[PDB]
Amino acid sequence: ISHGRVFRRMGLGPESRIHLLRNLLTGLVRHERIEAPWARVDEMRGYAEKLIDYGKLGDTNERAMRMADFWLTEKDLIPKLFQVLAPRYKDQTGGYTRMLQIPNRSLDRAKMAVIEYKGNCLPPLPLPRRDSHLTLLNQLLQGLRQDLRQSQ
Amino acid sequence: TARGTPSRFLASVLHNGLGRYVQQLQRLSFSVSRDGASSRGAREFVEREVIDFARRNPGVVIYVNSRPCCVPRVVAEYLNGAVREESIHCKSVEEISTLVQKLADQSGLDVIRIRKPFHTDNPSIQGQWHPFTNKPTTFRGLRPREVQ
Amino acid sequence: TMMERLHLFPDEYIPEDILKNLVEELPQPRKIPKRLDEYTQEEIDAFPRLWTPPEDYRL
Amino acid sequence: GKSGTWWDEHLSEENVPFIKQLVSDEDKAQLASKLCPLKDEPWPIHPWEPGSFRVGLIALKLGMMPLWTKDGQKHVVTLLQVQDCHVLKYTSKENCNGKMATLSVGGKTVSRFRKATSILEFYRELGLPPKQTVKIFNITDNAAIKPGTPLYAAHFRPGQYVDVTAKTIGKGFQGVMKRWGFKGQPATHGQTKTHRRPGAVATGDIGRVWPGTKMPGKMGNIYRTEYGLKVWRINTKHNIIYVNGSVPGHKNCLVKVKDSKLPAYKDLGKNLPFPTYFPDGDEEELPEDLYDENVCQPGAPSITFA
Amino acid sequence: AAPKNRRTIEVNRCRRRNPQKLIKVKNNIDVCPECGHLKQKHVLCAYCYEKVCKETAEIRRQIGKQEGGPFKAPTIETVVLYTGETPSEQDQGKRIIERDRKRPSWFT
RNA sequence: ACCUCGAUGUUGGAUCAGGACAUCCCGAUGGUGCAGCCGCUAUUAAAGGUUCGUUUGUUCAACGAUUAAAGUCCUACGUGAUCUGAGUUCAGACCGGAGUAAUCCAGGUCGGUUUCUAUCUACUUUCAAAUUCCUCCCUGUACGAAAGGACAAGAGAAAUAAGGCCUACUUCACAAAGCGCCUUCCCCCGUAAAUGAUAUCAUCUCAACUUAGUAUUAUACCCACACCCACCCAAGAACAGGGUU
RNA sequence: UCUCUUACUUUUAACCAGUGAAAUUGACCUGCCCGUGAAGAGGCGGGCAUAACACAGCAAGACGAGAAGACCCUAUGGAGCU
RNA sequence: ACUGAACUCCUCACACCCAAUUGGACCAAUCUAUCACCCUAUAGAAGAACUAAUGUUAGUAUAAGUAACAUGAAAACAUUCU
RNA sequence: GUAAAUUUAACUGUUAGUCCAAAGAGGAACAGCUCUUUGGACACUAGGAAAAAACCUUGUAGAGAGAGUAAAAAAUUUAACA
RNA sequence: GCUACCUAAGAACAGCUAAAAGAGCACACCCGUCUAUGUAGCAAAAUAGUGGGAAGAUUUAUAGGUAGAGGCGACAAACCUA
Ligand SMILES: *O=P([O])([O])[C][P@@]([O])(OP([O])(=O)O[C][C]1O[C](N2[C]=NC3=C2N=C([N])[N]C3=O)[C]([O])[C]1[O])=O*
Ligand SMILES: [Mg+2]
Ligand SMILES: [Mg+2]
Ligand SMILES: [Mg+2]
Ligand SMILES: [Mg+2]
Ligand SMILES: [Mg+2]
Ligand SMILES: [Mg+2]
Ligand SMILES: [Mg+2]
Ligand SMILES: [Mg+2]
Ligand SMILES: [Mg+2]
Ligand SMILES: [Mg+2]
Ligand SMILES: [Mg+2]
Ligand SMILES: [Mg+2]
Ligand SMILES: [Mg+2]
Ligand SMILES: [Mg+2]
Ligand SMILES: [Mg+2]
Ligand SMILES: [Mg+2]
Ligand SMILES: [Mg+2]
Ligand SMILES: [Mg+2]
Ligand SMILES: [Mg+2]
Ligand SMILES: [Mg+2]
Ligand SMILES: [Mg+2]
Ligand SMILES: [Mg+2]
Ligand SMILES: [Mg+2]
Ligand SMILES: [Mg+2]
Ligand SMILES: [Mg+2]
Ligand SMILES: [Mg+2]
Ligand SMILES: [Mg+2]
Ligand SMILES: [Mg+2]
Ligand SMILES: [Mg+2]
Ligand SMILES: [Mg+2]
Ligand SMILES: [Mg+2]
Ligand SMILES: [Mg+2]
Ligand SMILES: [Mg+2]
Ligand SMILES: [Mg+2]
Ligand SMILES: [Mg+2]
Ligand SMILES: [Mg+2]
Ligand SMILES: [Mg+2]
Ligand SMILES: [Mg+2]
Ligand SMILES: [Zn+2]
């Protein structure tokens, strides 16, 4: 019975779960794009968004600095987070950490995924685009939209 | 056992006794050995009885091949196409005469389970039973619990 | 399957298709021994009175 | 072979908010069209006879709350809210079993994009947005209501007894100690791998176990009915019922609420709105809260005994 | 506990060949709009993802050349350039990684 | 000594109980050397229940505190591929005795390995119609000579059991739970009485018949044939189920 | 330990991907009640039940599986000891 | 009055339903003597016939695709982190 | 009426038996209990008493889609009195 | 070459209290009281916790000797290559 029970059990305990997510997050802050199994990037995405919120709280805040000092295990990513990542999202509120499924790992056949921070000077992912407006169904719905626009 | 072998219905081949009876045997192909003790009874059969057998029922064509064989045989062919091959290996003269006489008598249908030994082709004369035989009719054909 | 071919009804009502299929109401086994009020007074005149009661008796 | 599809697969980038706005506006107008049933063409309203049974509702269990009475005792209530209730279809007395006529009643509104085609045809013929759950109420045919009418929470009155029935909370494949309340074996006095087992399941002569045997298995996803729950208070603005005690099922599920069937509450329906409360012809709008005469109201002189 | 009798091939064929154990046909599959290499819906195409990961690998190798050793990780945005392709004025302070190729016609 | 020694595991105890009534209690009646409260005996009734502790390994047995009651018996003296080995079925040893001795005791005592991954049958929510005690009134009445002391009707509180729940308390915390809270509705047949023949009285009737007398021909749930890549879920082993406006 | 159990973690467990055993097996298309029977029946008699098939549990039965009973008796079978 | 056997009758042919044991008529494979020459004959001979000994060896099934068994994370596959 | 009996030669095998009717002994005028005697049945086919060794009918062997037969189905319902 | 005993020449025993010590707590080491897992297991005797000894009748590295009607034995009829 796990009704209303968030937070998957990942490693060999609670602390090993925090360390697994910490290593995945440090790899994300350094390389800005990661592929890992799907459950792990789901948990780490939920952590990455609030890490960007702590980075956007400011540099002189001691609590945000403590959190960035814990969660970033390489200590050069703390100036990067407070001076590149947080100024990049100065306008946005919460839409970052785009996550998409990639097919399967070769050996053990796991569900893998890719998350990336937006901005991202890397080449873009082959995102699936919503269907174009000139198709048959959308031109019919555009005719319907224009007709009920002129009727009003 | 009868579930493990095929079965046929009792039948004539081409309605034999209705018009004229016809001998249902076509051929007898004999293969006997000149030297060889296994064909001694058949050797004596070809000596003494096959001439009278050929004169007896002339519908049958008889061939004697006289071939080196360790087991002599007789092949009996019937009118409907069937081929029955029997071995006369180390038999008497009386046993071979009995065998060729029994092959001469029977017809070419299969010797399997023969399944209801009568073949009436119009079994009923007064009219076959249906549930409205032996039942009386009622006025204007009214059913039970009818009104008009 | 033979019980699927059995159609049983508790009253005088039988549905219309089943009444349209019917042949041959079979006779009944028992004779229904015909209670006394249905005795068609000529039959009571047929049967003899078996004994003379005393005239001073009450019933 | 044909592949699967959904509603917004082939829609453009600009057509998805338009279709959401269009269908949301349409079923909002459809819910607002059925607002005055008494002015459309209502079926004939009858007075209450003593052998009568009226329709119920479908509510959504919000949560629980304490509730005090004038003697000082504390009772707990479950707040059932009647979100969007509508009579759907009526089946007469000779058409179901020859015993009692039935009425269908629909639950809260859900999306058209996630129902079967025949269900959408049924609601399109009826004229309502599709409902999540549909319950069948046995009524007598002098209490029949027109299909497409709204049922409200002032259908019930404070001081009455209802019977609520919903799917209980499912607890999965549960072992025999949590399911049937069995005892286990003791813990440490020598026991080898037998701390929560069922033990013996039959006798030795029988050579089988009976069909009624209690074993582990899936526990708790089954319809149960809570009988004889008093309704303390009715809120008319948000359409909330306050039944007494607990109600089977998790919060925000849909429960089926109808008046009690216990013999003690056989014919207490003479003072209840009978066909159903119609908020049009009442000629007097109800207060925001209808209280039983025992409950301490929130505006109260803070009771002092004597 | 031990088996009391050998399960025959009839009972075994009835068990191991029913539709609960057979492989289910899937129909999520269509051609990718670019490169036509048969992706699955809700899944990124492996050919296009292989393209992007090869180019990302070469960009990361050039970054690792420009950063010297480890623990360097600059405090400026980066941006990549191909042959030709003078730096824009808006990419002034940004780090410039130029490898050697034409700019591919999906990375704009 | 009839199956079983190419192995039917043995006593008690734990869990789970099924059944029979020759009934311990709750129900209803006949009689009494039944004035009342307790009682004795007989008929009917198995839907429900039948406690916690000290000693002995004990089933038996003694004792303490209770209760409406702490019932008998069968189920391989129920159930060890669910559990314990406390004694009881070895190898070590001590005491008393028998025996020259080895060794022994239906004599006592300390210690003494409990192996199995479920192939087949059966089964794995039957959706629901609960019982019992106690307090007040009656009443300090009926009853007796006094002590003593009831039925019936009514009201209220509880305990157990079944099904659910998280608003308070508690283990705990975007959940699960109890130590916590809510709900819980029909009988049961042995007799006691009118009219009246066989038998002009009388007689309750394996005479025709009339009452206490039958709860049920009970009502509540549950009952929409196909959008389904994918996401989420108070739904869930997989599958299945609900939402995606 | 218990009255009286409850919550969380790991291993275990279920699904997916790879490799991949062992005891056991007369044949089985392998149901229930009563009775019978080499005396305790899934295969016999009388009744009842009955579309096929996966997956996870439980251990009432198959007088369940391993060890030609280790207890009792026999053998003009052995051996140790006095 | 009918039904009711391997008893009896009816058409045909008849050696053709007991444990241990005994008597008898045949008979496949193999070698040898002489025949035979698409596989047989008359005699002599014997390592001369396997639905069964928890029989021996080898092959493959059932249990079973079951029990069980693995690789700390990202990445430039330089390196970094727990 | 019948057709077998006695003797000679040469051998193996059975000689750890059950139930029924009757005359008995032991036990409880108990046991599917133990031991003798007389007879039958079984360890040999078939039909019947429900399935059934021992109870009844019946034996000498096959084909038949003919017939006559043997044994072969348990019946009872009851207390008035001058 | 395991084990019972003996011979030759060796090695080890942190720290504290040291009453002087086949003394006390306690490491390394030797042994295996109790519990739990495991029972075709990691293991034909293990693992985890809990334990006794740990300056001595201690433990142990090497080589040699005592062998079956026997060797050896702080007598368990104990050990002598599972
Ligand atoms: O000497 P004593 O041992 O006390 C006998 P005493 O006292 O009897 P008394 O007067 O105490 O009466 C005893 C009960 O009788 C009741 N009583 C008296 N008068 C009436 C009643 N009860 C009635 N119901 N109605 C009357 O008229 C008293 O209440 C008392 O309880 O003389
Ligand atoms: Mg894991
Ligand atoms: Mg417990
Ligand atoms: Mg153990
Ligand atoms: Mg345990
Ligand atoms: Mg005997
Ligand atoms: Mg035995
Ligand atoms: Mg055996
Ligand atoms: Mg009784
Ligand atoms: Mg027992
Ligand atoms: Mg058992
Ligand atoms: Mg000990
Ligand atoms: Mg065991
Ligand atoms: Mg079986
Ligand atoms: Mg008094
Ligand atoms: Mg039986
Ligand atoms: Mg069997
Ligand atoms: Mg066994
Ligand atoms: Mg033996
Ligand atoms: Mg002897
Ligand atoms: Mg001897
Ligand atoms: Mg000897
Ligand atoms: Mg000797
Ligand atoms: Mg006959
Ligand atoms: Mg005869
Ligand atoms: Mg040989
Ligand atoms: Mg041989
Ligand atoms: Mg062979
Ligand atoms: Mg064996
Ligand atoms: Mg063999
Ligand atoms: Mg697998
Ligand atoms: Mg298995
Ligand atoms: Mg596993
Ligand atoms: Mg590892
Ligand atoms: Mg006897
Ligand atoms: Mg010392
Ligand atoms: Mg010490
Ligand atoms: Mg020693
Ligand atoms: Mg000794
Ligand atoms: Zn592609």
In angstroms, what is the span from residue A74 Cα to ligand 23's centroid?
Answer: 83
Q: Are D252 and D171 in contact (CB under 8 A)?
A: no
B115: CB within 7 A of chain I nucleic strand? yes
State the smallest CA–CA distance between residue A25 and chain D in angstroms: 32
Q: After which residues is chain B broken (C to N over 2.5 A)?
A: none
The experimental method is cryo-EM
Q: Which nucleotide is nearest to A37 (CA to C1')?
A: H73
Q: Which two tokens stand for residue D204?
A: 């030795």
Split into its structural domains, chain E has a count of 1
Q: Does D21 touch chain A (CB under 8 A)?
A: no
DSSP string, A90-111: SS-SS---EEEEE---SSS---
User: Can you list the positions of beta strands (E) in chain D?
Assistant: 57-68, 74-81, 85-91, 101-106, 134-139, 150-151, 161-167, 173-174, 217-218, 223-235, 240-244, 254-259, 289-291
Distance CA B85, CA B69 (A): 15
Distance, CA of A27 to CA of A115 (rounded, Å): 11
* Contact E/D (≥3 CB pairs under 8 Å): yes
HSE (side-chain half, CA atoms, 13 Å) at A98: 13
Q: What does the alpha-carbon distance between residue A104 and residue D161 come to, in Å, rounded to a whole number?
A: 58
Does residue E3 lie within any of the structural domains?
Answer: no
Which residue on chain A is closest to E96 by alpha carbon?
Answer: A121
Pairwise CA distance, residues D108 & D121, whole Å: 18
Cβ-count burial E79-103 (b if 16+ within 10 Å, e if not): ebeeeeeeeeeeeeebeebeeeeee
**Does residue E78 form part of some domain?**
yes
Please tell me the distance between residue A22's alpha carbon and the centre of ligand 22 in angstroms.
84
In this structure, how many other beta carbons lie within 10 angstroms of the beta carbon of residue A97? Answer: 19
Distance CA A84, CA A77 (A): 10
d(CA A47, CA A68): 12
Which position has the token pair 């699967």?
A: D4
Q: Under DSSP, is residue B41 helix (H, G, I), strand (E, B) or coil?
A: helix
Is E40 a member of any domain?
yes
Confirm whether E10 is domain-assigned.
no
Instruction: Calculate how far, in angstroms, residue B143's C-alpha sits from the geometric centre of ligand 30.
Output: 75
Distance of CA B72 to CAs B78, B87, B91, B144, D115, Å?
Answer: 20, 6, 10, 78, 85
**Does E28 contact chain D (CB < 8 Å)?**
yes
Answer whether B130 touches C (CB < 8 Å): no
D229/D165 Cα distance (integer angstroms): 11
Question: Is the residue at E14 inside a domain?
Answer: no
Q: Do E77 and A121 touch (CB under 8 A)?
A: yes
Q: Is E20 part of a structural domain of the chain?
A: no
The CA distance from D64 to B60, in Å, is 109
Packing angle, helices A136-151 and D15-33, rounded to 10: 50
Q: Is E53 annotated as a binding residue?
A: no
Residue of E nearest to A122 (CA): E56
Using DSSP bridges, classify how beta strands E95-98 and E78-81 pair: parallel, antiparallel or unpaired: parallel
C-alpha distances in angstroms, D139 versus D99, D104, D146?
A: 10, 10, 13
Does residue E9 lie within any of the structural domains? no
Nearest protein residue to nucleotide F174 (CA to C1' distance) is: A4
Helices marked H in chain D — which ranges? 15-33, 117-126, 176-180
What's the half-sphere exposure (Cβ side, CA atoms, 13 Å) at E26?
A: 7
Distances D219 to A2, D212, D223 between C-alpha atoms, Å = 14, 16, 12
How far does Cα D9 stand from its chain's mean position?
35
- Nucleotides on strand I lying under 7 Å from protein C-beta: 65
**Could you tell me if E26 lies within 8 Å of chain D, comparing CB atoms?**
no
Burial per residue of E17-52, b for 16 or more beta-carbon CB atoms within 10 angstroms, e otherwise = eeeeeeeeeeeeeeebeeeeeebeeebbbbbbbebb
Residue entry with tokens 């949301």: D24
Strand I within 7 A of B3 CB: no
How far is CA E23 from each of CA A105, C59, E38, rounded to the nearest angstrom? 20, 95, 20
B30 — phi, psi (to 5°)? -100, 140
Dihedral, D65, D70, D74, D78 alpha carbons, nearest 10: -30
Spacing of C-alpha E99 from chain mean position: 22
Rounded Cα distance, D34 and D148, in Å: 7
- CB pair distance less than 8 Å for B135 and C22: no
> Rounded to the nearest 5 degrees, what angle is found at the Cα of A73, between the Cα atoms of A72 and A77?
50
Q: A84 and E77: CB-CB below 8 Å?
A: yes
Domain range holding E57? 27-108
Phi, psi of E71 (to 5 degrees): 60, 50
**Distance between CA atoms of residues E59 and E53, nearest Å:** 10
Q: Which nucleotides of F are covered by protein (CB under 7 A)?
A: 14-18, 75-76, 78-85, 114-127, 161-168, 174-177, 181-186, 200, 219-237, 242-245
- Look at A126 and E42 and tell me if their CB atoms are within 8 Å: no
Nearest bound ligand to CA D193? 5
Say yes or no: Cβ of B123 under 7 A from any atom of strand I: no
Q: Do D12 and A3 touch (CB under 8 A)?
A: no
Asked if C23 and B145 come within 8 Å (Cβ–Cβ), the reply is no
- Which secondary structure element, helix H or strand E, spans residue B30, and what is its range? strand B25-31
CA of E42 to C1' of F125 (A): 40
A79:E73 CB<8 A: yes
Of A116, B39, B15, D262, the residue nearest E52 (C-alpha): A116
Q: How many helices (H) and strands (E) does chain D have?
A: 3, 13
* Domain ranges, ordered by start, for chain A: 10-120
Residue E82 lies in a domain: yes
Half-sphere exposure of residue D3: CA atoms within 13 angstroms, side-chain side: 10
The values of phi and psi at residue E33, to 5°, are: -65, -45
Of A137, A142, A148, the CB nearest to D10: A137
Residues 177-216 of chain D with CB under 7 A from strand J are: 190, 192-193
Are the C-beta atoms of residues D257 and D164 closer than 8 Å to each other? yes
* DSSP summary character for residue E102: P
Residues 4 through 33 of chain C touching chain B, CB cutoff 8 Å: 14, 19-20, 22-25
Of D253, D210, D294, nearest to D60 by C-alpha is D253
| Sign of the CA dihedral running D206, D207, D213, D215 | positive
From the list E42, E60, E107, the residue facing A124 with the nearest CB is: E107
E35 is in an annotated binding site: yes
Place of tokens 């050349």: E65
Buried b (16+ CB within 10 A) or exposed e, D170-205: eeeebbbeebeeeeeeeeeeeeeeeeeebeeeeeee
Q: Which ligand is nearest to the CA of A16?
A: 2
Sequence-separated (6 or more) residues with CB below 8 Å from residue B60: B23, B25, B26, B27, B28, B54, B104
Output the CATH code of domain A10-120: 3.90.1030.10
Question: What residues in D contact A132, CB-CB < 8 Å?
Answer: 12
Closest residue to F116 (CA, C1′): E1
In terms of residues, how long is chain E? 108
Distance C3 CA to F150 C1' (A): 65
Closest protein residue to G26 (Cα–C1'): E5
Cα angle: A141, vertex A147, A151; to 5 degrees = 145
Contact A122 E44 (CB under 8 A): no
Measured in Å, residue D190 CA sits from the centre of ligand 5 at 8
Residue A113 near residue A35, CB atoms below 8 Å? yes
CA of C55 relative to ligand 1 center, distance in Å: 75
A21, with CB counted inside 10 A (0-12, 13-18, 19+), is: buried
Q: Do residues D150 and D217 touch, judged by C-beta distance below 8 A?
A: no
Instruction: Classify A48 in phi/psi space as left (phi over 0), alpha (psi -120 to 50) or beta.
Output: alpha
- The CA-CA-CA angle for residues B67, B68, B73, to 5°, reads 65
G68 C1' – D189 CA distance, angstroms? 39
Closest CA to A125 of E55, B102, D154: E55
Q: Which domains does chain B have, with CATH numbers?
A: 1-148 (3.40.30.10)
* Inter-chain touch E49–A125, beta carbons under 8 Å: yes
CA of D139 to the centre of ligand 6 (A): 80
Tell me how far apart the alpha carbons of residues B45 and D44 are, in angstroms, rounded to a whole number: 113
Neighbours of ion ligand 3 (CB under 5 A): D 184
* The dihedral formed by the CA atoms of B140, B143, B144 and B146, expressed in degrees to the nearest 10: -70
Nearest to B99 by CA among B86, B109, B111, B112: B86
Resolution of the deposited coordinates, in angstroms? 3.2
- Cβ of residue A22 closer than 8 Å to a chain E Cβ: no
What is the CA B71 to chain-centroid distance, rounded?
25
Spatial distance between the Cα atoms of B28 and B60, rounded to a whole number of angstroms: 7
Residues forming a β-bridge with D86: D106, D150
- Which secondary-structure segment (H or E) carries B78? strand B73-78
Q: How would you list the strands of the sheet with D85-91, edge to edge?
A: D134-139, D101-106, D85-91, D150-151
